[PDB]
Amino acid sequence: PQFSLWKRPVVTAYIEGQPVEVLLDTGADDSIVAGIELGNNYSPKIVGGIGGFINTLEYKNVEIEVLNKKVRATIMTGDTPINIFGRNILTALGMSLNL
Amino acid sequence: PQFSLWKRPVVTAYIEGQPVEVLLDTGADDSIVAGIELGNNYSPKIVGGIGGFINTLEYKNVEIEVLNKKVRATIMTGDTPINIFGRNILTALGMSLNL
Numbered sequence: 185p186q187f188s189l190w191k192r193p194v195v196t197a198y199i200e201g202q203p204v205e206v207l208l209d210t211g212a213d214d215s216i217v218a219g220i221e222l223g224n225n226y227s228p229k230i231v232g233g234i235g236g237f238i239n240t241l242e243y244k245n246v247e248i249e250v251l252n253k254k255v256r257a258t259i260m261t262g263d264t265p266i267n268i269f270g271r272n273i274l275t276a277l278g279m280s281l282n283l
Numbered sequence: 284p285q286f287s288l289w290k291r292p293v294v295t296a297y298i299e300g301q302p303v304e305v306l307l308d309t310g311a312d313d314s315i316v317a318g319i320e321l322g323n324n325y326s327p328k329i330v331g332g333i334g335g336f337i338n339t340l341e342y343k344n345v346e347i348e349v350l351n352k353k354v355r356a357t358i359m360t361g362d363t364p365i366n367i368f369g370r371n372i373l374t375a376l377g378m379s380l381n382l
């Protein structure tokens with residue numbers, strides 16, 4: 185889906201089968217989502233946002249399906265205000281930003 | 284201009300002739316930058332990001348020159364670790380996400 189940015193780039197994706205609404209964020213290097221139970225193969229990590237740092241759990245090689253393409257990427261679960269799909273997933277989707 | 288997202292999309296923006304380095308962010312609605320003087324017709328606002336809330340001064344209708352185009356958009360200034368150009372500027376530039 186070509187994304188005219190007139191409407192916030194929000195989409196529904198499946199993170200290991202569970203559907204979640206995520207924001208396509210070209211400013212974030214990482215992806216972070218609240219509320220899904222991905223498991224016990226984690227590693228506490230810290231992600232620094234624009235307002236401060238939050239503790240998160242890093243999950244490697246997770247199956248993600250968004251915009252009809254399946255990818256495997258690192259997702260971090262934490263107490264985040266909005267769910268964000270960062271550049272690590274956008275690049276795996278082959279997503280670019282055009283002018 | 285196309286921007287693969289392999290690297291953070293950081294460009295140099297001239298806001299009222301003052302050069303700043305801004306991160307092109309699709310996820311953000313507003314644009315925030317620090318270290319620039321925009322005058323005295325502002326409105327104090329609060330923006331919520333990952334990690335916390337940010338105090339800002341909002342300036343409407345400012346001349347911005349970035350990616351070879353000139354626009355008039357609202358810019359917020361605040362003590363942010365990273366200058367972000369959000370959707371309000373990206374729509375004005377005519378940018379779109381792709382694939």
Ligand SMILES: CC[C@@H](c1cccc(NC(=O)CNC(=O)OC(C)(C)C)c1)c1c(O)c2ccccc2oc1=O
Nearest residue numbers: 209211212213214232233234268310311331332333365
């Ligand atoms: C602009 C930052 C960015 C973000 C999101 C998710 C993870 C990370 N973290 C990274 O992947 C990059 N981290 C990084 O550059 O670290 C700092 C200390 C220099 C900021 C950053 C970011 C937003 O798009 C954003 C968009 C809408 C609302 C609040 C937001 O609130 C943010 O914070």
